[PDB]
Structures are given as structure tokens and as C-alpha cells.
Amino acid sequence: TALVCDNGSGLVKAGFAGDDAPRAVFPSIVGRPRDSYVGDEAQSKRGILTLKYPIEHGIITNWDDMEKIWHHTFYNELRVAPEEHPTLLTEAPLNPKANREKMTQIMFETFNVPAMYVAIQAVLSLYASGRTTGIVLDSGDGVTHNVPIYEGYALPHAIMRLDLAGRDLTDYLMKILTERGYSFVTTAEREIVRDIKEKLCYVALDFENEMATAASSSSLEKSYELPDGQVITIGNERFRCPETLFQPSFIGMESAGIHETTYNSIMKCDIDIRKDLYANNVMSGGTTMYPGIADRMQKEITALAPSTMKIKIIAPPERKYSVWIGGSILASLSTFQQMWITKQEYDEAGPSIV
Template sequence: AVIFDNGSGLFKAGIAGDSGPRSVFTAIVGRSKVKPAMLGAGQKECYIGEEAQSKRGVLSLNYPVDHGIVTCWDDMERIWRHVYDYELRIKADERPVLLTEAPLNPLQNREKMAEIMFEDFMVPAMYVAVQATLALYASARITGIVLDSGDGVTHTVPIYEGYCLPHAVSRLDVAGRDITEYFMKLLLESGYSFVSTAEREIVRDIKEKLCYVALDPTQEMKAKPEEIMKEYRLPDNNIIQIGNQLFRAPETLFAPANVGVEAPGVHKMIFNSIMKCDIDERILKEMKLQAPAGVFVRIIAPPERKYCVWIGASILTSLTSFRQMWVTKSDYRDFGAAAIHRKCF
């Protein structure tokens, strides 16, 4: 089977049974700013992934997945077609496909996925699974609460015996992209201006390499500047020095008010989700502060968590018992796009 993990920032694709995805690229589509009729030889109307990133100066860029939800189906279909033709180099009608979705994804989005896959790609069978559930499978568990914070959206998802509990899911529209933007603002206050889309990628790289979550941000703010100062070499070989911005940016996950979002932080979201049910050390500390005495809290953060959802999907589709879960072409013929709701919960 083929597995497509549709993230807001990264698209992961591969074949079931593999230990990791074969193709990982930025989920972005770039269209030429000039009219198609005026394109020169060798120029394409649209570019996908890293190719679009490298030509960002002459393209208008679009992320088809925004805050975990597909907002542009034409571009999403282009990405899927690109993966089949150029990344995996296999025919869509030869293998079933498993697609991932965010918790609380609108039902019509799921139906649209089924429609495109059966009508346009002619897949023999498909399945749609919630990303957080798959991430839990990847850590060899079927019950737990998953904090899924990607590029576009953060969810806390309680899962019992492999089933997501929708009534207890909490959603926060603050994630990696928002932290990058807030980090850009903090750097600007220090005199470092990063404004273009190309410069945004530099800031994202600084964030991924140097930023950290402080165990106690108040204490960290009292530290001497030289104790927390880090250096980063820019592509033009200039070196910049960055101080408390390195932990103030990720602090947004615990204090969304920093970016103007009136919502509880991730530690409170987790607690609220647990209460509605029948980032590691810091989360553990916050959870222990809120948990009653004697309640043991354990946080699992596997090193390969960037691909946890994809790995979980690979495990799930490799199970012999999963064969009966596929939504087949005959199901689609009998029940239409709504067939997807009969087996995918």
C-alpha cells in the first residue's frame, strides 16, 4: 500500500512495510507570476516542494494545507500526482492508499479525498486515518493522549483502544509556523531584519537548530546574557548573536497570548483533554503541578517523532487484520463518497 501523510508543512510519502517514508518535502506549490502563454522554454506553470522553494523569487507560493485542513484541492491533487509520478514512480491504480487527516477534519473534506482518489487516480482501495492515532501506534500503544504539534496546528487527542475521542480533542491554531513568525518579530526587535520568504527559511533553520523550551522561563530571563547567547552563521558568512529570543519564541506554545491568541497553553490543553475523558520535561513539570499527589505522569517523545504518523500508518497497513478495513472501489460505487465514513472513524 501507498501512504500519504498530508502535513501543513511537510508531505511524507512511502510504501507500507518500510521503516520510514521514501519521500519527504515541503508541502508547497509555486505558480509562475507570468502568464502561461509567456513562459519560456524549460519553464513550467507550477513547481512543487523543494523545486518551488528554490525558485521562490519568481513564484507565488501556496500551502494547500492550512492549519491542518486542506484549503486548495487543486494544489493538493497536484502534490499527490507529483508523488505518484516523480517521487514513488508507481501507478496509482496498482495499490491501495492510506491518507492521513487532522482530528476534527470536516466530513466533506474526507469525502472529497475519496472522490479524488477513486475518480481521478482510480485507486483500488483507500483508507483515511487520524494522524494522532497513527502516532500512538508508532510508539506501540493503543491508549494514551497525543500532543500533535506540527507546522500549522496543535492538537491534544485522547485515544482509547485505538479510537480517537472527538469530544475531548483540544485544538490550538498556534504551531511551528507561528513560532517562526514570532521569532522573526523578536529578532527584528534586536536589530536583525528577516522579511522575505527566503529569509523566513533562514529563521526556521535557526529555530530548529538553536531554539529550546526553558524549564523555568522566569529563571532563564534572569540569567546573564553571555550564559544563553548563541551564534549562528548566515548564508553570507556573517555571524549573528542571539540571546533570550531562543526560548521566548517556543514559549508561545505555553503562552499563546504572546502571538495574540486567546487560548490555554499546551500543558493546560492536555489537562483539559484528560479531564474531558471517561515538550517533554517542561510538559512533565507542568502536568505534575496540575496532577493530584501520587498520580504518575509519563511523557513519551521518540527521537523519530517527526515521522511517527507515517511509521504508525506503515505498521497499521502491514497488519493482516487491516485488509478488511480498506474502502474499496465497489464500496465507492455502491455508496458514493460517503462510503469513507463506514469504515474510517
């Protein structure tokens, strides 16, 4: 049975083609002493380990550590002999061929997989939504991408990248949370802020009005009970965290907001298919999970684009695993048999085959 691995900057999603969800989801972290630990086990012993993220902004930068992530994925997580399973791996859009070459070489030469295939994350997400044309807003832990896609293929010139995502958001919430008096500095407390971000944060339909409402009543305030018993209150930080997506300025980035990069990306594609991009904005990624993000994006984009144009945002309820699901469907198709790359063909052609 084919395996499907979606190597994100923060979480690795892994499972079996045919399943509607990844069986394994763990941190993309490798820890080494003074001979290595991965994911939760790496975090358990963070005290005696130097922790590193092998994937930076969706791009693999540490091959020695990436190898440990894959070893842990196959053996510990899935409990399977790599040599008996065809493997589908995902990659960030505009990923350097050298990287795709290294990826392939490691799979075949160190894990001896019988066959493999590398798919672009944004395109798998679009397939999962039952579309061949549209534009994907892909937002995770380490990067956000705007990928317009026409008839199955990502339009190279129009792709946009924004190095701001979930981790940055967590960092910001932690920052404005202290200002409000509270304090989460240590590594152990940062997990608390992430839980607050995922449980209480949301996108305001209108930032200005929410700021007003919050300075007057306490109608927007939600309580968050700490483990030790304490109960801290969160008010405007709920929608100020996600606001950073539309206004990267909050964290000091002259960068354009996600509504802005979506519009610019659509604007760099043939005008004839623009009506289609506008009506097929698909969002995928943990960081697009905030409640109210569809409505905001819906309003922000019609403000930018000409009023006669019809805007439609598709925000799938499981968009956090959309990439993995699209690959699960892809690697299950009777046609996928031919598009693999076999170990045999690799032994002859080498890296230049992927």
C-alpha cells in the same frame, strides 16, 4: 505495495508501508504562473509563481491544488502508478466528512487507486508508540492537537485544537530577532530563521529563571554562522521562541498553553481512564522536537493535576515522522487487507462509503 501518505500543513511525508521512515518529505506548496509546480520546484521559481498552501491548519481547503500535491507525490516523488497500489492517507482529527468524501472521490476517480483507507493522524502516532490508550500532543507547522484516545478510539468531546504551531513560532522568532537588531524580512531570509529555530531553540525548564540567567551571563548564548560568513549571536530568543507554546499570549492569543489544553482535554474524559491518560502523554510532530519540552510538560502538568497522580511523557526520538510510521505499520498488517475500501465497492456506493 501499499503507499502511505501523511498530508501535513507544511510537509507531505510519503513512502512505502513496511519502511521505517518516509522516502519522500517535501513542502505542501503549489505554485501557479501568470501550469503548476509543487514543493521545492515551486519554491525555486517563487518569483513567477503565486504560492499557496492547500492544507490550512491540517484541513484541505484547496482541492484543485491538493490534486497537484498528490500527483507530485505519486509520479515525481514515489515514481509509481497510482492504479497498482493500495493507498493509506491520513487526516486531522475532527475533519469534516465532506472533506473525507472529497478526498476519497479524488483518489478513486482521478488517480484510480485500487483501494484506500483514511486514518486519523493522532491515532497513528499513538500506535507507533505501542499504545492503544493515551493522549497525544500533536504539533506541526499549521496546528496543534490534544487527542485523548481510549482503546484505539479518539474521544470526540475531549479533543482540543490550537491553531498555533511551527509557522507561528518561526514568525515570532523572526519578530523578536529583529528587535535584537538583526533583520530577516524577505522570503529568502525566513528560511534562515527556521534553521535557527530548529538548531538553537529549546524549552526552558523555567522561563523566569532562564530570563534571569540570560540577562546576567552569556552562558546561554550560542553563535550562528550565516552563509555569507557573518556570525550573529542569539541569546534569550533561544527559549523565548518555544515559550510561545506554553504562553500563546506572546503572539497575541488569549489561548491556553499546550500544558493547559492537555490538562483540560484529560479533564473531559471519564475519570476512570484519566490515570491512564496522565501516564501516556505521547508527543508527535516537528514542533514537539524542541530539547527540554518533555521535562517542562512534565512539570507543568503535575502542577495542574492532583499530586498523587503519576505523570509520564513519552517523547519518541523520531516523533517528527511518528504519524507516517504508525500508518506504515498499520497498512503492513495481514489484517489491513479487509479494512481497505476498494475501487469496486466505491463504484457502487459512491462517496458515502469512506
